[PDB]
Amino acid sequence: MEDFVRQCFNPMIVELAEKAMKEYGEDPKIETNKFAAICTHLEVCFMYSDGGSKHRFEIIEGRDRIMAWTVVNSICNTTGVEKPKFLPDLYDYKENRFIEIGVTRREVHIYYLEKANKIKSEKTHIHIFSFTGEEMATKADYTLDEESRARIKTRLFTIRQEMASRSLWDSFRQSERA
Ligand SMILES: Cc1cn([C@H]2C[C@H](O)[C@@H](COP(=O)(O)O)O2)c(=O)[nH]c1=O
Ligand SMILES: [Mn+2]
Ligand SMILES: [Mn+2]
Numbered sequence: 001m002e003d004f005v006r007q008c009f010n011p012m013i014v015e016l017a018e019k020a021m022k023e024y025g026e027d028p029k030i031e032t033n034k035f036a037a038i039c040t041h042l043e044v045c046f047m048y049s050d051g052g053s054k055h056r057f058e059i060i061e062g063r064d065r066i067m068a069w070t071v072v073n074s075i076c077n078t079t080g081v082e083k084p085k086f087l088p089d090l091y092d093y094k095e096n097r098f099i100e101i102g103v104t105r106r107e108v109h110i111y112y113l114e115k116a117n118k119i120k121s122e123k124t125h126i127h128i129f130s131f132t133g134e135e136m137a138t139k140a141d142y143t144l145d146e147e148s149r150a151r152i153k154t155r156l157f158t159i160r161q162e163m164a165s166r167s168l169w170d171s172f173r174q175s176e177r178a
Contacts, residue, residue, distance in 0.1 A: 051148035
């Protein structure tokens with residue numbers, strides 16, 4: 001699994017993921033499924049941000065904490081949007097709302113409710129993806145065009161397929177907890 005991550009994700013993504021885990025006191029070489037989940041999530045976030053107009057999205061995930069909240073607070077101050085309690089993943093300039101992205105090894109609906117329950121904030125939009133082609137977004141508003149979405153969904157299947165061809169999928173798939 002460690003070798004899989006290092007081969008399938010780019011070095012920038014792998015460095016951010018390694019850093020995030022170490023910040024929690026976890027070793028990417030040991031909690032290898034979490035390493036892969038974090039990389040996959042980061043990758044999805046970057047793809048989503050590249051999926052509309054140039055400049056449509058501000059990326060929040062992947063920034064250090066200080067720069068993250070600088071972006072968030074600056075956005076809230078300039079748009080008067082409500083200040084979220086937790087850092088979201090992106091801001092959508094066109095819709096004027098924060099986005100929370102989830103990638104799940106379980107099922108799209110359960111993860112959606114878990115995110116909803118954490119968020120509280122009425123405004124932050126939630127969009128969940130799975131590795132089996134499903135998606136789920138607040139008020140069935142999927143934000144991006146279906147071709148952008150299809151590229152994310154396809155990339156996640158392609159990850160799943162690679163993990164399975166290395167016999168990594170079964171363990172990965174059962175590693176996410178409520
Ligand atoms: C906020 C947070 C996320 N994560 C992981 C869970 C997900 O795989 C990934 C992204 O989280 P997010 O979906 O809340 O943006 O980071 C942690 O391990 N610890 C944390 O404190
Ligand atoms: Mn995040
Ligand atoms: Mn997220």
